[PDB]
Design a protein around this ligand. Structure first.
Ligand SMILES: O=C(O)c1ccccc1O
Ligand SMILES: O=C(O)c1ccccc1O
Lengths: 207, 207
């Protein structure tokens, strides 16, 4: 298998967060390393497991607990939930006190586990004033920029939003779980030249 | 009556991801001064069984190019817009107006989400498809960090140009206009609060 020569198409399951986290650097990497490969990505919900066997999908990335049968996996990284708001929010502060967190208004994302973030808050007596609720993360960044709403966001998602949308963060005041993002491949392809190649490239660019 | 300034009702809205970061930002800013205690929730048109949910009253309004919704559904057109071509502000060699000849030549990111790609292929135009993603969240970053170009809806481009440092070109191929509509179920045509939300949209969106 020669990367610089290959015209193969690799297919990857990953979340939306995982999409705008992973792809940008990856594409930049590939531009110089494998200039003729093609990449396609899809969501873990449109389905998988079978597809990984069939060779329809090559790798998958996320907090996929479902996968644990004929599935090798390597941890890339963990990261924490953070609290994100516009740089000049009228009254938000870092580190945010849990007391203040209760008090402000939030946008919540329904969405990988995650999470069940909102479960832990509610059980700890903390009832957020939930002004908006969205299914996934695309609009989050703009929304914070144009309003005084705060959000509970995964750390590496925050990172890629701070500049474009002019927002900052705070360590999260509540006790929430760490986020363990993993790389998964089907055993049947453990010894596939090209697949191992992609695997290592990920491990390389992320860790 | 209804009273917006007093109401604590929750409105539920079906819309795409593009529609989410297009509509929500301005809407939330609008509501902040007009209805400060209302709550909004949004979901994807694939999410529930929308059609049924709109009858039920589980979803109040829906926004998009939803052709499925015919029959017991009133609808008003908000706007149309065209497909554009989008690339980073200093792309090494991309130009505006992009010639169809150059379009064929550069490398693209394609979004899976109404067959644009069908019409290209039928017109003999085989793009060099370096990446393919399911929806739009990562598009903006991706163009920023690479020399890839994309075929994007106009009003989506608008909200990306600043944050990610990209510009556009009128699209060199013949592609359909995009007709975005507002839909509500007949059963609720005469609902005070629903009519209120309807009008607010009609108001904030048009030209
Ligand atoms: O939550 C995920 O699945 C995830 C995936 C990739 C990068 C960051 C993430 O939070
Ligand atoms: O589908 C939508 O709701 C939409 C909204 C704004 C711009 C383009 C779109 O497709």
């Amino acid at each position: 298998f020669d990367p610089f020569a290959s015209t193969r198409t690799f297919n990857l399951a990953m979340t939306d967060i995982g999409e705008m986290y992973f792809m940008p650097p990856l594409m930049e990497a590939l531009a110089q390393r494998a200039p003729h490969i093609q990449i396609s990505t899809l969501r873990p919900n449109a389905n998988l497991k079978e597809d990984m066997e069939s060779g329809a999908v090559d790798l998958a990335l996320g907090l996929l607990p479902e996968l644990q049968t004929g599935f090798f996996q390597r941890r890339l990284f963990r990261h924490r939930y953070v609290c994100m708001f516009r740089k000049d929010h009228p009254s938000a502060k870092s580190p945010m006190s849990l007391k203040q967190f209760t008090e402000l208004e939030h946008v919540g994302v329904v969405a990988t586990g995650h999470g069940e973030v909102d479960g832990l808050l509610e059980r700890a007596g903390i009832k957020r004033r939930m002004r908006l609720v969205v299914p996934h993360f695309i609009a989050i960044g703009p929304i914070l920029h144009s309003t005084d709403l705060i959000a509970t966001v995964p750390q590496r998602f925050a990172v890629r939003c701070e500049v474009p949308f002019g927002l900052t963060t705070s360590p999260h005041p509540a006790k929430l779980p760490d986020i363990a993002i993993n790389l998964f491949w089907h055993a049947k392809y453990n010894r596939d030249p090209g697949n191992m190649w992609l695997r290592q490239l990920f491990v390389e660019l992320f860790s």
